């Protein structure tokens, strides 16, 4: 029977009623997440792009799929993903990890894991060909005649992902009362939650996002935001291939709108932004201070501070070098102790 083991302030996540949590399901998912044999040609596991060492992200601006194509976007973290209202960077239709998983697995455009109908069965057989995997699926899905399929692979990995969290940060300790925040950290903190810096509007939930969804959430929030990273045409256009919410609705005023990412482990998940185009957290704050980014040079040139689509809440906010460092100091309190080195989420294959 699954113990959530949550702080007071985190309610349990919504679990799809036909895929209940269990420890057998968790460990199977962990083995499959890290197994290079789930990809079409056997070169990549999920963990290739979602490294533990980096809070389950890549360290690269974009990622490299199993046939060697680049992804159009930066690989976000999978930690805490059980609480995300909408999964990836800009898609209101992906609202379940089970559903989302089909993209990395079967998506071409571009190939990531590289599972097609041509190799579908071949992959599955690889797990039936294995002694240890037969125990696991069997022990995890006991009500099933044939318990190694793709519905079973998705269910397991989904369970694993819901088990990936540790509300372990200095910020979390602070909120529980086990820790005092630094003078710098307090001053960054008061900025973050103040109507000058404004970060709590979009990064101010206990998930440090504004799409926090648990198992009690009714009438969910779900907003998206243009933050003025670009204005390619002088009309607020973001460069192809990343239009954000526009790419799904076709509505012109959703151009450059993205989900606000959770800021948990932000210190560890650089590069930043939807396309990895901001190298450091110092440059991020520079950008918020100016109400947007100005690209002075080449193909991406334009000024996002002046974009028409930009959010109401991002204005020019002349923050002093002091206030910027205090705010940077506060973002560094959002890294987890456990997560990066816990045996629980480590590669089980060595």
Q: Which of 86, 161, 269, 311 binds Ca ion (CB under 5 A)?
A: 269
Task: Say whether 84 counts as a known binding-site residue.
Answer: no
Tokens at 36, concatenated: 């290079």
Choice between 102 and 215, CB closer to ligand HEC: 102
For helices 23-33 and 131-140, give the axis angle rounded to 10 degrees: 140
Answer yes or no whether residue 265 interacts with Ca ion by CB under 5 A: no
Stretch that binds ligand HEC, among 14-22, 144-152, 163-171, 284-292 (CB under 6 A): 284-292
Answer yes or no whether residue 26 interacts with ligand HEC by CB under 6 A: no
Residue 198 binding: pick among ligand HEC, Ca ion, none (C-beta 5-8 Å cut-off by kind): ligand HEC
d(CA 187, CA 139): 51
* Residue recorded with tokens 């968790």: 26
Nearest CA-CA partner of 97 in 50, 37, 44, 130? 50
Q: If you compute the radius of gyration of the chain from its CA atoms, what whole number of angstroms results?
A: 21
Answer yes or no whether residue 288 interacts with ligand HEC by CB under 6 A: yes
Q: Which of 254, 258, 309, 336 binds ligand HEC (CB under 6 A)?
A: 258
Is there a contact between 21 and 15 (Cβ–Cβ < 8 Å)?
yes
3-state helix, strand, coil in the chain (%, to 5): 35, 5, 60
For the bound state, the minimum distance from the C-beta of residue 281 to Ca ion, rounded and expressed in Å, comes to 11
Q: Which residues of 190-208 are buried (b: 16+ CB within 10 A; e: fewer)?
A: ebbeeeebbbebbbbbbbb
Task: Say whether 135 counts as a known binding-site residue.
Answer: no
What are the binding residues?
46, 49-50, 73-74, 88-89, 199, 202-203, 259, 269, 271, 273-274, 288
Residues that bind ligand HEC (CB under 6 A): 44, 46, 48-50, 63-65, 71, 73, 75-78, 81, 84, 87-89, 97, 100-101, 104, 112-113, 157, 161, 192, 197-199, 201-203, 225, 227, 229, 258, 260-261, 266, 269, 272-274, 281, 284-285, 288, 311, 313-314, 327
């Amino acid at each position: 029977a699954w113990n959530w083991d949550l702080p007071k302030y985190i309610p349990p996540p919504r679990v799809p009623v036909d895929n209940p949590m269990s420890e057998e399901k968790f460990q199977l998912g962990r083995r499959l997440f890290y197994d290079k044999r789930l990809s079409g040609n056997g070169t990549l596991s999920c963990s290739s792009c979602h490294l533990q060492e980096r809070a389950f992200t890549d360290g690269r601006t974009v990622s490299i799929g199993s046939t060697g194509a680049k992804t159009p976007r930066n690989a976000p973290s999978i930690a805490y993903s059980g609480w995300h209202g909408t999964l990836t960077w800009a898609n209101p239709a992906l609202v379940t990890l089970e559903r989302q998983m089909l993209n990395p697995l079967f998506g071409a455009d571009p190939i990531e894991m590289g599972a097609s109908d041509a190799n579908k069965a071949e992959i599955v057989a690889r797990f039936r060909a294995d002694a240890d995997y037969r125990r696991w699926f069997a022990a995890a899905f006991p009500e099933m005649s044939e318990p190694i399929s793709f519905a079973t692979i998705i269910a397991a990995i989904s369970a694993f992902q819901r088990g990936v969290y540790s509300f372990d940060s200095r910020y979390d300790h602070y909120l529980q009362g086990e820790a005092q925040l630094t003078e710098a950290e307090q001053r960054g903190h008061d900025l973050y939650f103040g109507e000058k810096a404004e970060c709590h509007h979009c990064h101010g939930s206990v998930g440090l996002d504004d799409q926090f969804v648990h198992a009690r959430t009714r009438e969910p929030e779900l907003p998206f935001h243009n933050t003025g990273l670009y204005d390619i045409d002088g009309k607020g256009a973001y460069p192809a291939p990343n239009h954000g919410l526009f790419d799904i609705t076709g509505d012109p005023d959703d151009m450059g709108k993205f989900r606000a990412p959770s800021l948990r482990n932000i210190a560890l998940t650089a590069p930043y932004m939807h396309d990895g185009s901001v190298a450091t957290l110092e440059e991020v704050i520079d950008i918020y201070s100016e109400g947007g980014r100005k690209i002075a040079s080449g193909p991406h040139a334009g000024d996002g501070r002046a974009s028409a689509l930009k959010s109401g809440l991002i204005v020019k906010i002349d923050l002093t070098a002091q206030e910027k460092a205090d705010l940077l100091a506060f973002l560094k309190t959002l890294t987890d102790e456990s997560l990066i080195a816990s045996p629980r989420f480590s590669d089980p294959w060595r």
